[PDB]
């Protein structure tokens, strides 16, 4: 079918069809553009008009420009040929390496898996990060969140996870950059090329990249998440294999949805969000799941506007994740990195029957001691450390040692700290914290525990500190 632009307002284009209308969510191609501009139908306004959001700049559009109706939603190339490439929302490559030559095209809109497909098995995924492994352990096939404002470590943490899990992971992997800095996209492309997950010579690439950065109009940011999700879904089903799916950030999907709602005629809700915030986020987060046919481990970075965890967007996102690791600025100011908040992070598998009673008891002891420390900090502000019960000082000392011992140096944060990255096996973290609580180290100074891997490294650092005393 052929239609005709009748209005252009910002990123929203109204297209009139003289024949039969196209169904909602269909992709339309504007005729007369040097590049490829794809509109996506979002509403039927009657009188044969359809409102649409443009997946690209609507500059140079003319009231009357003819439009073609593709007849299907946006169909992206999928398969093992997308690995090592980069893509738009509409699937065309932006790595300047030639066409993606697949046999399968998958539409980016699909129904979520039905209830009779859910896997109910959980088993810890050891990431090598002390705080994550101890207090909010992840799980294979589960959805992970990384909340936190700006400048707290979301990108560094997710890069560290790609460095660890993805490098030594047999299955494939997908990375969707949604409305993030293009500098970071280029940096990740080059870091993968150096590491070897993206191989530009052979066909041994293990990572497929999709990018829709923050220079894109809202239409493209609101859908690049669906494009990456489609690639991951295909690798989950047809390939029948494990997949990882990293998204950064998944707040830009919501925000991009909010930048066009007012122009689509919807009354705003809550703090100027679209009325369909929860439904729009659910119809996406419900396709990122571990069905019985495959298994997607989804790590999501979630911007929290102004550190406000009660904002509608992060607040709604909380209910869609198994594990969460709420990075905190108040802890990043102290220099504890990663700034994961030990009391605001949770996991579903964190039960004594899934991890074990030793792990569970160590984690709960750490959390309790930190909460008691918080209770004491109010008193120390009036008395002073000198006036505390000789037992309370012990709680404060243990709490500070535990606070420092959760910090860890990443292999990707060499540039900042200058130190060297450490991977700490789970047993070593449990032993370290159990010993720190049991009192087997109440003579070493606090700073010995700052930015070290296993506990023995803290002992060695203390020895060095004493020798050069």
């Amino acid at each position: 079918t052929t239609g005709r632009i009748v209005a252009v307002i910002g990123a929203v284009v109204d297209v009139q069809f003289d024949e039969g209308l196209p169904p909602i969510l269909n992709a339309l191609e504007v005729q007369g553009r040097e590049t490829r501009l794809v509109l996506e139908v979002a509403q039927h306004l009657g009188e044969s008009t359809v409102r649409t959001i443009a997946m690209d700049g609507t500059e140079g559009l003319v009231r009357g420009q003819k439009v073609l109706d593709s007849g299907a939603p946006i169909r992206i190339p999928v398969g093992p040929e997308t690995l090592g490439r980069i893509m738009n929302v509409i699937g065309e490559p932006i790595d300047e390496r030639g066409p993606i030559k697949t046999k399968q095209f998958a539409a980016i809109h699909a129904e979520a898996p039905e209830f009779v497909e859910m896997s109910v098995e959980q088993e810890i995924l050891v990431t090598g990060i002390k705080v994550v492994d101890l207090l909010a352990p992840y799980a294979k096939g589960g959805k992970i969140g990384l909340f936190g404002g700006a400048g707290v470590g979301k990108t560094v943490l997710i890069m560290e996870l790609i460095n660890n899990v993805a490098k030594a992971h047999g299955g494939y992997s997908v990375f969707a950059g949604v409305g993030e800095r293009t500098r970071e996209g280029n940096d990740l492309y080059h870091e993968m090329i150096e590491s070897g997950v993206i191989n530009l010579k052979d066909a041994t690439s293990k990572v497929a990249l999709v990018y829709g950065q923050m220079n894109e109009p809202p239409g493209a940011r609101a859908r690049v998440a669906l494009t990456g999700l489609t690639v991951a879904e295909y690798f989950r089903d047809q390939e029948g294999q494990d997949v990882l799916l990293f998204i950064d950030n998944i707040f830009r999907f919501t925000q991009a949805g909010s930048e066009v709602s007012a122009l689509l005629g919807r009354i705003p809700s809550a703090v100027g969000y679209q009325p369909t915030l929860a439904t729009d986020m659910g119809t996406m987060q419900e396709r990122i799941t571990t069905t019985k046919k495959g298994s997607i481990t989804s790590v999501q970075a979630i911007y929290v506007p102004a550190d406000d965890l009660t904002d509608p967007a992060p607040a709604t996102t909380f209910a869609h994740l198994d594990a969460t690791t709420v990075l905190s600025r108040a802890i990043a100011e102290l220099g504890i990195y990663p700034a994961v908040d030990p009391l605001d992070s949770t996991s579903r598998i964190m039960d004594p029957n899934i991890v074990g009673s030793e792990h569970y008891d160590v984690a709960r002891g750490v959390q309790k001691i930190l909460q008691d420390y918080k209770s004491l900090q109010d008193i120390i502000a009036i008395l002073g450390m000198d006036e505390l019960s000789e037992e309370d000082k012990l709680t404060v000392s243990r709490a500070r040692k535990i606070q420092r011992f959760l910090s860890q140096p990443f292999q990707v944060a060499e540039v900042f700290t200058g130190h060297l990255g450490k991977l700490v096996p789970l047993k070593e973290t449990i032993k370290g914290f159990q010993q720190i609580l049991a009192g087997e180290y109440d003579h070493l100074p606090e700073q010995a525990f700052y930015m070290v891997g296993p506990i023995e490294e803290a002992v060695a650092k203390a020895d060095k500190l004493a020798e050069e005393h």
């Binding site: 009748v6 209005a7 252009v8 307002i9 910002g10 990123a11 109204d14 700049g57 609507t58 500059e59 140079g60 559009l61 003319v62 009231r63 009357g64 980069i86 932006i94 790595d95 300047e96 700006a150 400048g151 409305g179 800095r181 293009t182 500098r183 996209g185 280029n186 940096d187 492309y189 080059h190 990018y211 950065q213 923050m214 220079n215 109009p217 809202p218 925000q255 909010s258 930048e259 066009v260 709602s261 007012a262 122009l263 705003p268 703090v271 100027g272 911007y303 506007p305 102004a306 550190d307 406000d308 100011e333 220099g335 540039v415 900042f416 200058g418």
Partner: protein, 498 residues
């Protein structure tokens, strides 16, 4: 006599060609927005012209009329007027012909001084460079402020943010950065020359005149463009000035050269955009800003790239200036631009009045590049200074034992070292010398109230007797062992003799 003759020379060449042009009738004009009827083939965000020679941009394409925003005053447009489409998306002149010229948001010379000889034009609304052209930020952008070059370094291609309250010293940092580039621009190698662009948005014309005369005094208009969309300029011009300046800088980076652009402020471009959007009747959003208020800035700051050597190698740094209300960084536009940019530079009034100027809050100020984009000498010294200040800030709220007493002493010495004056940026090697003297425990003997004296005096000594050492540090770009031994003896001698 010849005055009239050169006046005639202007008539001698005119614009005889009258063409058959598409048009439209102004159904309704009011508040700076016209609703033209006609212009069937007018594009989106095209430039149209009015019967009085006044320009405008077709922003809304509704089925029944075209919503046009007037780039200028609105009293001269009547109803039933005539709007002629120029058939060209909004674009501005670009080139080295603009250097040293004050121009308005549309590239018209504003200081007399004749016209612009620009031989090329560039569209304001151009897409940012892809993911492949760019390359990680390597070189350092020398700002001249000690606390910025040492603790929150800025590379070329980075997008720093200067955010603070009113009258904390943001334009001062911008002007110091602009003035410092004189030493590099005067030299010979073209790989260090950095052409500066200053976009002045919503600032009263007196402020921009003060700024331009200040740059002229420091002989810094040889390489500066000033794009002024002052307060009395219709909102459609304050909206568009950042994009015009960004095009003027995109021309430089696209041709292997380096550019610096300073939007000042972006919090006023946001207000102008809100006024435009509310007068086009588009529904408001949060705090009445349109929904597309993040896009507005993200598409603008994403053009500050660092092209790889295949695409010329040119760069374009950006230093947007935001203005918070009583330090409420958590506001709307501040948070948007904070999550758009790379680093930040938090200026605080509590530090401005406590004597710390520039007020740069080194505790919160960040720079993602950090390590990279810093000279090796500065990298060596500022690291230890950063650790010392980080330790000092923990134990500062009070004021015993020798170790912590000396820690506080060192912290205070460094703090009074980081202070600075106005429009006197320092060469990187001089900063290295001063910071080295301060951090190698030499100043710990002196009183803190006297540190500034030393600082000043020290430079005026090293700048004359030991020019060779500073040249060595600059050329070799590191504190070699022999350079360190020299520095050591110079500081030891000078301290006692003072």
């Amino acid at each position: 006599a010849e005055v009239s003759s050169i006046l005639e020379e202007r008539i001698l060449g005119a614009d005889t060609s009258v063409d058959l042009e598409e048009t439209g009738r102004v159904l309704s004009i009011g508040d700076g927005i016209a609703r033209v009827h006609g212009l069937r083939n007018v594009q989106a965000e095209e430039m149209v012209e009015f019967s009085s020679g006044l320009k405008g941009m077709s922003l809304n394409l509704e089925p029944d009329n075209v919503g046009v925003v007037v780039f200028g005053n609105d009293k001269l447009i009547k109803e039933g007027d005539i709007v002629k489409r120029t058939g060209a998306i909004v674009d501005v002149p670009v080139g080295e012909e603009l250097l040293g010229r004050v121009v308005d948001a549309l590239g018209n010379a504003i200081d007399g001084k004749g016209p612009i000889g620009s031989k090329a034009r560039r569209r304001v609304g151009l897409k940012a460079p892809g993911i492949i052209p760019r390359i990680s930020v390597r070189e350092p952008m020398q700002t001249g402020i000690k606390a910025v070059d040492s603790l929150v370094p800025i590379g070329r291609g980075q997008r720093e943010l200067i955010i603070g309250d009113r009258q904390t010293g943001k334009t001062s940092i911008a002007i110091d950065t602009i003035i410092n580039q004189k030493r590099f621009n005067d030299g010979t190698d073209e790989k260090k020359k950095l052409y500066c662009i200053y976009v002045a948005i919503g600032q009263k014309r007196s402020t921009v005149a003060q700024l331009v005369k200040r740059l002229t005094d420091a002989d810094a208009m040889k390489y500066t463009i000033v794009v002024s969309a002052t307060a009395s300029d219709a909102a459609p011009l304050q909206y568009l000035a950042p994009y015009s300046g960004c095009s003027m800088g995109e021309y430089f980076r696209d041709n292997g050269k380096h550019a610096l652009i300073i939007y000042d402020d972006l919090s006023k471009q946001a207000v102008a955009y809100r006024q435009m959007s509310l007068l086009l009747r588009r529904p408001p959003g949060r705090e009445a800003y349109p929904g597309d208020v993040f896009y507005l800035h993200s598409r603008l700051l994403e053009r500050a790239a660092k092209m790889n050597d295949a695409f010329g190698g040119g760069s374009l740094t950006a230093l947007p200036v935001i203005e918070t209300q009583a330090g409420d960084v958590s506001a709307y536009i501040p948070t948007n631009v904070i999550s758009i940019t790379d680093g930040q530079i938090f200026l605080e009034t509590e530090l401005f009045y406590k004597g710390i100027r520039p007020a740069i809050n080194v505790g919160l100020s960040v720079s993602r590049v950090g390590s990279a984009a810093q000279t090796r000498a500065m990298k060596q010294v500022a690291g230890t200074m950063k650790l010392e200040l980080a330790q000092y800030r923990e134990v500062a709220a009070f004021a015993l034992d020798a170790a912590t007493q000396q820690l506080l002493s060192r912290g205070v010495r460094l703090t009074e070292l980081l202070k600075q004056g106005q429009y006197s940026p320092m060469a990187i090697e001089e900063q290295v010398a001063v910071i080295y003297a301060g951090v190698r425990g030499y100043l710990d003997k002196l009183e803190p109230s006297k540190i500034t004296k030393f600082e000043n005096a020290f430079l005026s000594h090293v700048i004359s007797q030991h020019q060779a050492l500073l040249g060595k540090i600059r050329t070799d770009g590191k504190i070699s062992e022999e350079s360190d031994a020299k520095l050591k003896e110079i500081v030891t001698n000078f301290l006692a003799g003072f």
